[PDB]
């Protein structure tokens, strides 16, 4: 029937509008008029999938394919559903089957590429995106995702046109009020204006509001005082990252450090228990731990939050994997603030504050954010390194004249081992002379042996960490052996400067590699140290470096290492060269914990300024460049003026303890101060305003 057709078409536009509830109702009326309506089934499945009703979606997709066995669109959209359910094999069958039916089906090629990208097969993902774009040259989703693949592997072919193309695509989609193909979590990597980046984020917040409007929940009424909570402020931390994830590696100590007399801490996990000590710790130390992964419906979950009586609800995800921002769109709490996991604005009106600081987000630049600024006193960034990696608070070296980063030892029991040795000299850095002991250590390293015993102490090869104690390798336990780290373990020169960056390669852009090459040309006795992150980016970096006048052997790549080895091996470098496009954030705390000075050039985006905010708190303004020339000058100076390098390294080494940077107790008390500032402001009936 054509009556069914008009119902189906009306529902389609209702969906476009984001009236999810209305679309569903019309699709069902269509199937009531004309039950064998394959397209209606497939369209109903699609709006059901949008609501999270994945099993019901599947049922209607299979119905549409039953009616119409070559319905390629249904296979492709069905595979999207299977992908959301984590059934990657199913999705592959669906996508591949759609392409067999119609080899000119661009969307199906694009959807297959995304599967390849997710599994890390960037070469195959790039190839399938190019088919999509060949079959359908105006294809923003496929173009923007291809651009991100090329970013991941440091493919800069036609880089400048690509950037211009991305801005134009985003410009066109934002005008037409569609959902931009550049993901908000990627938009700092491209030369979009701040308003475009804020607009991309806003479009994604709107998606959340559409999905919760179909719930018809009335506003929550919020506490106006602290009387039902015995005078305590109720803070709820929402995260899908309570477990083995950088977010827990940064803030896992903070819940248990809250003051129980003034604060009551609720942790709302959006992920299931992954079994790691990170999840154990947060569960054990929060006042209340709620596993909202058991509660997939956002209406109940926000109910569950509202009943706990939360005054401040902290969004730790923004637009990252596992987020459930519908919860915040429902505003179960009177104050909702973005905290630490999302380095950008949400652009969403249901977020009141972004917890940042003066250096990361100077007021002059407040227009990049939809949220009011909430300044922590130093840096908003934090790290749990003092708790996870205390064996790195002290080190000793071997005098194989005296380097602090060629052959290093760390250990909780290091002092006792040193006291068992005949000759040891201090410089304060203990130095072990090249005796019989010192040769056994180097013997173990050279021979690839896993461990040895000296004077009863266990001496571990820093490369064999997951065989000696895998929980210590990941940061879940503190190593209970003495660990030996050397430049020889990584092919690093004993007799030259080592510049390092341990970030994912996608943070490098053409300008940054050019700066780095300028630096290494000026410091002939030096190498750049990078990670295979991923390894398929290695040959592109090598080539662009050689086209910049840089021999292959000046750049030394290593594999990604387990967490503790990654942090520990940063001691081997002299200097970290930070990525300006997007700094090291977590990785910036890792490198500073090793005592390694970091040169940075803050841009304007929040993600381009985190490193400079860390160094300001650390108290090392001399490492913060105002432009590329200053960046190269600071890096070349640290690589040539060796007494100055010695001075700056001692400053970092000492300041990582005496500054607030790694001081989670002080940070938790600053955060508390800032919370009461937020609350009192609202408790006097004011709306969110900037908190400095």
């Amino acid at each position: 029937p054509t009556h069914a057709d008009s119902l189906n078409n009306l529902a389609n536009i209702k969906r476009e509008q984001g009236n999810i509830e209305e679309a569903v109702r019309l699709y069902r009326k269509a199937l009531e008029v004309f039950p064998e309506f394959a397209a209606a089934h497939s369209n109903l499945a699609s709006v059901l999938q949008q609501q999270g009703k994945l099993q019901e979606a599947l049922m209607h997709y299979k119905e549409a394919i039953r009616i119409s066995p070559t319905f390629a669109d249904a296979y492709s959209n069905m595979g999207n559903t299977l992908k959301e359910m984590q059934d990657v094999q199913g999705a592959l069958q669906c996508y591949t089957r759609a392409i067999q039916i119609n080899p000119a089906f661009a969307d199906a090629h694009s959807n297959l590429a995304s599967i390849h990208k997710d599994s890390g097969n960037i070469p195959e993902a790039i190839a399938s995106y190019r088919t999509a774009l060949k079959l359908k040259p105006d294809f923003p989703d496929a173009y923007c995702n291809l651009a991100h693949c090329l970013q991941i592997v440091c493919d800069w072919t036609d880089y400048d046109e690509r950037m211009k193309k991305l801005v134009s695509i985003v410009a066109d989609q934002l005008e037409k009020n569609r959902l931009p193909s550049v993901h908000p979590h990627h938009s700092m990597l491209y030369p979009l204006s701040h308003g475009f980046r804020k607009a991309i984020a806003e479009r994604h917040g709107n998606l959340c509001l559409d999905k919760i409007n179909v719930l018809h929940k009335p506003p929550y009424e919020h506490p106006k005082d602290l009387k039902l909570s015995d005078g305590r402020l109720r803070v709820g931390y929402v995260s899908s990252d309570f477990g083995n994830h950088p977010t827990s590696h940064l803030m896992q100590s903070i819940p248990g450090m809250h003051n129980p007399d003034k604060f009551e801490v609720f942790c709302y996990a959006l992920s299931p228990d992954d079994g790691t000590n990170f999840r154990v710790k947060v569960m054990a130390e929060a006042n209340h731990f709620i596993d909202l992964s058991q509660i997939p419906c956002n209406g109940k979950a926000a109910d569950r939050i509202h009943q706990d009586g939360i005054h401040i609800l902290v969004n730790m995800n923004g637009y990252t994997k596992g987020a459930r921002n519908e919860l915040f769109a429902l505003r179960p709490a009177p104050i909702q603030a973005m905290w630490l996991g999302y380095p950008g604005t949400s652009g969403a009106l249901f977020m009141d504050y972004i917890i940042t600081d003066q250096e990361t987000s100077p007021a002059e630049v407040a227009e990049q954010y939809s949220e009011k600024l909430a300044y922590m006193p130093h840096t908003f960034f934090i790290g749990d390194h003092a708790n996870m990696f205390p064996h790195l608070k002290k080190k000793a070296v071997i005098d194989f004249h005296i380097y602090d980063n060629r052959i290093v030892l760390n250990g909780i029991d290091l002092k006792a081992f040193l006291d068992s040795l005949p000759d040891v000299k201090i410089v304060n850095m203990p130095v072990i002379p090249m005796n019989t002991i010192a040769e056994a250590v180097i013997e173990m390293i050279n021979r690839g042996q896993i461990q040895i015993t000296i004077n009863g102490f266990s001496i571990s090869n820093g490369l064999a960490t997951t065989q000696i104690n895998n929980k210590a390798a990941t940061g879940e336990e503190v190593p209970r052996t003495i660990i030996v780290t050397t430049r020889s373990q990584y092919g690093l020169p004993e007799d030259a400067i080592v510049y390092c960056n341990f970030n994912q390669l996608y943070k490098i852009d053409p300008s940054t590699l050019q700066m780095w090459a300028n630096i290494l040309k000026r410091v002939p006795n030096s190498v750049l140290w990078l990670l295979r992150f991923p390894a398929v980016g290695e040959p592109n970096i090598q080539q662009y470096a050689q086209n910049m006048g840089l021999p292959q052997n000046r750049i030394i790549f290593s594999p990604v290492a387990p967490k503790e080895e990654h942090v520990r091996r940063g001691q081997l470098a002299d200097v970290c060269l930070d990525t300006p496009l997007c700094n090291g954030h977590t990785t910036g705390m890792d490198v500073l914990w090793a005592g390694t000075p970091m040169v940075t050039m803050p841009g304007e985006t929040l993600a381009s300024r985190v490193a400079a905010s860390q160094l300001t708190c650390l108290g090392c303004l001399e490492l913060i460049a105002k432009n590329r020339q200053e960046y190269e000058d600071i890096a070349v100076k640290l690589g040539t003026d060796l007494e100055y390098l010695k001075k700056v390294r001692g400053k970092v080494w000492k300041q990582r303890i005496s500054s607030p940077l790694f001081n989670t107790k002080q940070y938790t008390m600053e955060l508390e101060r800032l919370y009461l500032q937020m609350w009192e402001h609202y408790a006097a009936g004011n709306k969110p305003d900037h908190m400095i």
Binding site: H186, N244, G322, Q504, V560, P562
Partner: peptide, 12 residues
């Protein structure tokens, strides 16, 4: 890492 996992931030 090879022989394990290194979780990172990733878009939803």
């Amino acid at each position: 890492y090879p022989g394990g996992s290194t979780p990172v931030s990733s878009a939803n």
